[model samples]
Target: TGSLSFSFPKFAPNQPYLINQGDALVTSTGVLQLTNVVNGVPSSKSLGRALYAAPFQIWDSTTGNVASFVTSFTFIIQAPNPATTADGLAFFLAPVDTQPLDLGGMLGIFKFNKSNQIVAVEFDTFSNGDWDPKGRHLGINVNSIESIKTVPWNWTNGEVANVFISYEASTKSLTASLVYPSLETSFIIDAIVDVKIVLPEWVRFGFSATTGIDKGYVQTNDVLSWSFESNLPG
Candidate 1:
């Protein structure tokens, strides 16, 4: 088994990491704000990707090329504009930095006809009538924003929540668990395809978020800390 960990404690803004695009800031309290609530004018849509020091190995190329991994993070989402809460954020693994031109409902993860291999777990708060059911939820996406599996978002507003996502190479299974202060849920699905077929040995890992004009124009997505681990997918 292997382990990797990251903590966003108090640090100077943009000293260690930079937001590729969109409106993000590091608070004096050490919170990474992906998006902030705004007042007046056309609300801005942001496409932001924050990467680490460098790329990391998702699987050993010389070995059997199978990958088993786990990742976890803590975040808080606050909707100041409850009536206009527009979109949400996602944690992504991509061959390239996770940044898309389209914001809004896309969650800054995908573009039209884009040929990129990306896997994402989304905590979507806004509901798009076509792809999303009403209310908040969590989902897993292979390459597109459309999720294959989803469950209701059951955390209290503005409360901190812990998320754990993992993949098992042996069983070809993917699992996700979300724990709120008082509630929790877990989901697992069979995802047997070898990831190395489309993804490189090393990939970027990070987060992306967006706000829409219809509603939720003013909101905040903050990350307290994050950790990732990779080991034999047994």
Candidate 2:
């Protein structure tokens, strides 16, 4: 139950190891659409999640060691205009086969106390309240909705974002970098947190996006490609 890697050059419906929930879909262009926007009007209250079916072992209890992992993906958030984008997308690790999280400010990363074991890297576009450091921020979150650390993330609206997320077992650090290739810009952020303390041995890793009414224009999110690798030694 350790050391696994996978790559998806593009996405399609009914893939063998990928599962889509709520408004998530694979577009005709093969991108993984996290919320409806093309075939129908984007919902006023929308939430979508795409998950990796096989649970990765995050820790080897016998050796008291946590896993080291790296994941990369190319994604985009767009609408008819930049004004339409609301909420955001996240990369998260949660309990295997568990239910998805709530919508809006939660970024589908937390579901009440049900999210006690979750850790997420959030690309937030809107600020709902004092709970946030404000719009267009990249955050690393643990358990609760608030971010452990956040940095201004100028996403260049409608631009393609190339992201890399990794965990170093030695330093117990969670790190990420969001790059805009066409724009020649990059933002890197990290937080010191032990995954073994916040995540289960067996965990599901994936992406989530949500759209709520009265936030902004009807927004859409998509992931064009993805790959993940991890090592948990026994």
Candidate 3:
């Protein structure tokens, strides 16, 4: 493994290094636009996802070594109908061959067979009665969309939210920090999980999002920038 670390101050026009699925697109202006709707229906694809083309050696199989990581990203969620916000985005680590799902509130990463192998940090704007809190929240999810831990988001429509997520290999501690600079408000949430047990030895990592078919109105989720770093031994 050459190891892993990359920074996209802005996605290059057509960001060829990523694998996009469903409605995901990299705008010419360098925004990773994850989802959009035209006239109350999904523009064409209902789900959106963007992940690194190559998988990371999350763990050294022989040595049983797991890598710790730090990632930071800036993203925005805007609703055409500002009075309400729906659906949301997630920074996820999943099996190398996972595909985005169309389930509206699942954030597109709900795997049918690999459900037990997904770990994600969610910025949930919509409150589904099943697994979400009453309003927007930041969550650390492992193995299920139902968060292992969640904290209120202090969400501001169309505002850019800066997020920091990291993992400690020794403690198996995963943390999620969300900040809204415009309002100087933020939230911190965390959970404990041996990521190597929640994920495959090798995995793909990136963002995923979705809009509802009947749950809400049209909205756009844009990723402004991203940086990810990890330590893996030779």
Candidate 4:
């Protein structure tokens, strides 16, 4: 958290439908954002977005006030693209703009066109060394820089990854766990478990996805099976 800077705010959700803003939210903490907010019936290869700014900060990450920041948001994906060859990219808590990371493979998602947010948890389907942990593994990256020495993560199913991320402002820790529809047992992937919190009044969170190597239409399932919850009892 040195010279890196960014803005954070909650975006409007086109609930009961979809809202498309065109791009995703990247953070200084390697987290990326994505969501199918467009009002429509779910289809294959369907993608949506929500920006931190109110205006057309559309494609360019620097066009808006999103200097450089951190945040956490919830995203849902049900019955996604079953294409085994295509690499599925998800919204990350990245350190830069969540633009089309045209580096090919999973790097296409982490490598920002500008010096924006720089970190992420790539639930990648395509196996790229810079993004994948074992070329077929899940990974945690830092600063959008691609390198085994710098970016490290484990591998799993990008389409089947289902869970909610909870962040507590009191603690600087993040916890993620999953209970898939196909699996009876739930799994917790808290590599280095802790309670992390964002004290600032505003933060950014959203979703992002791209058609990776597996050139099939990717789908962002909107089954609220997963969510971001706080300490408040419901």
Candidate 5:
């Protein structure tokens, strides 16, 4: 409904928003979702092509169980002025169960032990050690460098992009989908369906950017343009 760059008592519709403006109130976990559109990748000047984050002192989560989801987005990447190739960024569920994250080249935020408690959803652009050209893809990961499941990345052609995702408690599954931009295209990439079990009860949600050893000639873009629906049951 709004950008992650939102501020309470400001972007918020109501005045005197109840939530603390600063660090006063801390929840066990938090979920952040964005519905924004940002352009420009730093093809030459910087590593990030075009990136935007929900700006604020939002803390990463790690107190207990964690659950999260991101549905779909209109990732309309143009061919660039003089198209070159590079990698895309990752949407994340980082865990403060370990240390704070490192910034910039090391990839933005979402750094944690690659083994336990943390999980990630990578919408990878460039293929590196973690990816292959077999497909522009989406991946799920645990603590290791390997992905549990990955799907070929494909989007229907059109002007605007949209998608939806959520956790279904009754079926004990994680469900998701991507709608084609061309209304007649009738294509979809089902990232997760019949997930099989419940995700953690709580967690931190955000996005991160990483470039392969080769710049791939693309700019940075953030995940604040995506949406998530978690009306799953217990």
Candidate 6:
């Protein structure tokens, strides 16, 4: 029973991946760029999900057991204007490969009227009136867009930040830590969920983001670096 670990943007560019029907590219700068700055239209949505080419087992079918996992990444969200930053981004795990439908407030992670097995952590910047009451916040959701647990996060425009997310199978707990260098702020949220039951036997881990331009200012969500680790069968 050993741990598996690796890093990203450390890999070669042009790595084969699925865009979930949206625009996604690996730039020459060696970063995973999810969305571009060209479109500034309201309700414009984009999604990019990249998983290990080789599938990993979450649980063994014979024993029906699972283990804990840890993942971390650095990202930057840039907008032409701070006031116009819309929607947000999400780090998610899903049972299927199909991308979420175009939904403005869902952060391209979930869709209405569709049943899916998904666990998502959203870093939201826009308040959608009801689902979100405040602007800057983080949430953890299971099978639904509505978060089960949420905490506030101090976000800055065009600033790089780091996030560490982990799940403990023994306690069935999920925790997320958001670290901002500019404001020297650190925020964390923890929730309890048994992924062995909530998720499929095998799942894909990746990210998705959306945009809603209010005053015509383009925005971009970029992944500078990423690393993930989990326990593997002995």
* Winner by TM-score: 2
For candidate 3, write residues 114-143 as lDDT tens digits: 554898999887788888878888888887
Error of 1 at 33 (Å): 0.8
lDDT digits (tens) for residues 74-102 of candidate 5: 44333243244344444444332323233
In model 3, where is the ten-residue run with the lowest total lDDT? 37-46
TM-score of each: 0.82, 0.94, 0.92, 0.48, 0.53, 0.87
TM-score (C-alpha, index-matched) for candidate 5: 0.53
- Predicted structure 2: lDDT: 0.83
User: Candidate 3: misplaced stretches above 4 Å?
Assistant: 37-45, 111-116
Backbone clashes under 3 angstroms, per model: 6, 1, 0, 54, 18, 0
Model 2 C-alpha lDDT per residue in residues 1-234, reported as the tens digit of each score: 469898988986666578888888887789898887756555556788998988899987778888899999999887665654678899999888766667777777785564458989998877767678867789999988789999998867678999999999989989999999998999999899888777777898899988766735567778999999999866
Q: Name the candidate, 4 or 6, with the larger TM-score value.
A: 6
Q: Lowest-lDDT window of 10 residues in candidate 1?
A: 184-193
- True-structure RMSD for candidate 5: 9.4
lDDT of 6 by residue, 1-234 (tens): 345677775546765643433666676777777765455322345555555554445666677667688899988888777776767778888765646555457777677333477888888877777777576789999887678988887777778889999988778889999898777889999999778777776777777777764445346777788888888454
lDDT of 6 at 64: 61
Against the true structure, candidate 4 reaches a TM-score of 0.48
Q: What's the lDDT for candidate 5? A: 0.36
| Each model's lDDT | 0.68, 0.83, 0.81, 0.35, 0.36, 0.72
TM-score of 3: 0.92
Lowest summed lDDT over 10 consecutive residues: which window, candidate 5?
19-28
Instruction: Give the C-alpha miss distance for residue 167 in model 1, angstroms.
Output: 1.8
Q: Quote model 2's TM-score.
A: 0.94
